[PDB]
C-alpha cells in the first residue's frame, strides 16, 4: 500500500496550510498525522482522521474521504514549521504500519533579518598543529537561504571550502558556518581572505588577513 504526500507546502503566517495524503480508497482507513520539528521527536497531532490528542491546539484539524486525507493548519505560526507525516495501520498484514513520504512545511514572510557574520582567523594553537582553518560564523538571519563566497586577495576560491546548510534555531532564525581549509603557507602567502555572505541580494563584507 502506497501513501503519497506533496514534498513541500509553504504559506505565510496567519494563513491556512493544507497537507494532503493520497491513497487508494484511503477514506476507508484511519489516518494519523505526525509533526516533527527539526531535532525533536515526532508528535501525534491528529489521530483517527480528525481527532486531536490532548494538548494539541484547535487550529489543527484533519479529514479523510475518498482517496485523499487532509491535514489543515489554520492561523499558521512560525512554530508550526516542521515535517508532517501521514500514516495508516493495516491489521491482518505482515506490514501493519505504512508511513507517507513526508511534507516539509515552510513558513514564509517572517520578519526579515540581515546576517550577523563572525570571521575567526586560524588559532595560534592550530598553526602550531600544522593546520590553518578560517571559520565564518553566520547567525540570526531570515529567510534561511544564504550563499557564501570565499575570496583570496580579490579573487574567488572554490577549493577547501566546506559550507553547511542553514539550520533553524529556537528563535526561528537561521545559523550557518563556513570553513576554509588552507595550508599554513596558503594562509601567510595572501594579503587577505574574505567571507562575503550574500543574503537576499545583499553582501555582508568581512575580510581577514595574516598581518
Amino acid at each position: 500500500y502506497e501513501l503519497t504526500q506533496p514534498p513541500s507546502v509553504s504559506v505565510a503566517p496567519g494563513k491556512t496550510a493544507r497537507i494532503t495524503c493520497a491513497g487508494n480508497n484511503i477514506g476507508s482507513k484511519s489516518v494519523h498525522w505526525y509533526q516533527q520539528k527539526p531535532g525533536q521527536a515526532p508528535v501525534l497531532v491528529i489521530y483517527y482522521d480528525s481527532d486531536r490528542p490532548s494538548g494539541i491546539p484547535e487550529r489543527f484539524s484533519g479529514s479523510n474521504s475518498g482517496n485523499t486525507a487532509t491535514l489543515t493548519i489554520s492561523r499558521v505560526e512560525a512554530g508550526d514549521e516542521a515535517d508532517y507525516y501521514c500514516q495508516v495501520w493495516d491489521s491482518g498484514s505482515d506490514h501493519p504500519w505504512v508511513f507517507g513520504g513526508g511534507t516539509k512545511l515552510t513558513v514564509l514572510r517572517q520578519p526579515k533579518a540581515a546576517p550577523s557574520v563572525t570571521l575567526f582567523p586560524p588559532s595560534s594553537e592550530e598553526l602550531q598543529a600544522n593546520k590553518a582553518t578560517l571559520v565564518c560564523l553566520i547567525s540570526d538571519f531570515y529567510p534561511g537561504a544564504v550563499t557564501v563566497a570565499w575570496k583570496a586577495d580579490s579573487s574567488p576560491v572554490k577549493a577547501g571550502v566546506e559550507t553547511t546548510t542553514p539550520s533553524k534555531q529556537s528563535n526561528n532564525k537561521y545559523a550557518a558556518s563556513s570553513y576554509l581549509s588552507l595550508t599554513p603557507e596558503q594562509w601567510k602567502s595572501h594579503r587577505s581572505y574574505s567571507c562575503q555572505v550574500t543574503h537576499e541580494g545583499s553582501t555582508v563584507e568581512k575580510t581577514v588577513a595574516p598581518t
Binding site: 489521530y47 505482515d94 575567526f120 566546506e162 545559523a175
Partner: protein, 178 residues
C-alpha cells in the same frame, strides 16, 4: 510517561549492534512497542513491532532475517538486536509505543554504519570568542561552557560561540579561552 533509547553509536558494515529502549511512567506490558528509523534528511521508516500480551513480531522487508526485537517486562525495556549491518541501515532509531497510532516517542538514538574509525574531538580556541572542535566521528557532539557540524575528509567539525567543554561518546574535552 517516557521512552529513553540508548546503545547507538558507530559500527562497521557486517557488524552487529543491540539497541535498548527504557520505558517509564506507564505499564509497559499493556502496550505494543515499535521501532521506527529515519535516515539523514529522509522520511520515517517503520522497522519492527512487538504486540502486548501475545507478543506477535513483525518486520519490514528491508530488515528481515537480520533484525530481532524483544522485550523485558520486569525491567520495562525494549530491545532491537541488529545484525549484518549495511550502509542503508544508517539512521536515527526511535522507540515508540502503542499500535494503530504511535502516541509516545523517544528522542531516539543514532546508528552510524561506516568503515571509518571513531575519534574524539580536537579543540582549538578562537579569537576575533569561539571554540573549534575538529576530527571527531560520529557527529554526536554537544557544547557547554550553537552551530551545525560540517563534514571534512570523512570527519566532522563544529564551532561554538559565546572555558569550553564538549560532550562526545569517544571522549569529553575541555579547553581554555581568553
Amino acid at each position: 510517561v517516557q521512552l529513553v533509547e540508548s546503545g547507538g553509536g558507530l559500527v562497521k558494515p557486517g557488524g552487529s549492534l543491540r539497541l535498548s529502549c527504557a520505558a517509564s511512567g506507564f505499564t509497559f506490558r499493556s502496550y505494543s512497542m515499535n521501532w521506527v528509523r529515519q535516515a539523514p534528511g529522509k522520511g520515517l521508516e517503520w522497522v519492527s513491532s512487538i504486540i502486548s500480551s501475545s507478543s506477535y513480531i513483525y518486520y519490514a522487508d528491508s530488515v528481515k532475517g537480520r533484525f530481532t526485537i524483544s522485550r523485558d517486562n520486569a525491567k520495562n525495556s525494549l530491545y532491537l538486536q541488529m545484525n549484518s549491518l549495511r550502509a542503508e541501515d544508517t539512521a536515527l532509531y526511535y522507540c515508540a509505543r502503542d499500535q494503530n497510532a504511535m502516541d509516545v516517542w523517544g528522542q531516539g538514538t543514532t546508528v552510524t554504519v561506516s568503515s571509518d574509525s571513531a575519534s574524539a574531538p580536537t579543540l582549538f580556541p578562537l579569537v576575533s570568542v569561539g571554540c573549534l572542535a575538529q576530527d571527531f566521528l560520529p557527529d554526536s557532539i554537544t557544547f557547554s561552557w550553537g552551530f551545525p557540524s560540517v563534514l571534512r575528509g570523512g570527519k566532522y567539525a563544529a564551532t561554538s560561540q559565546v572555558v569550553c567543554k564538549v560532550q562526545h561518546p569517544n571522549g569529553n574535552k575541555e579547553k581554555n579561552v581568553p
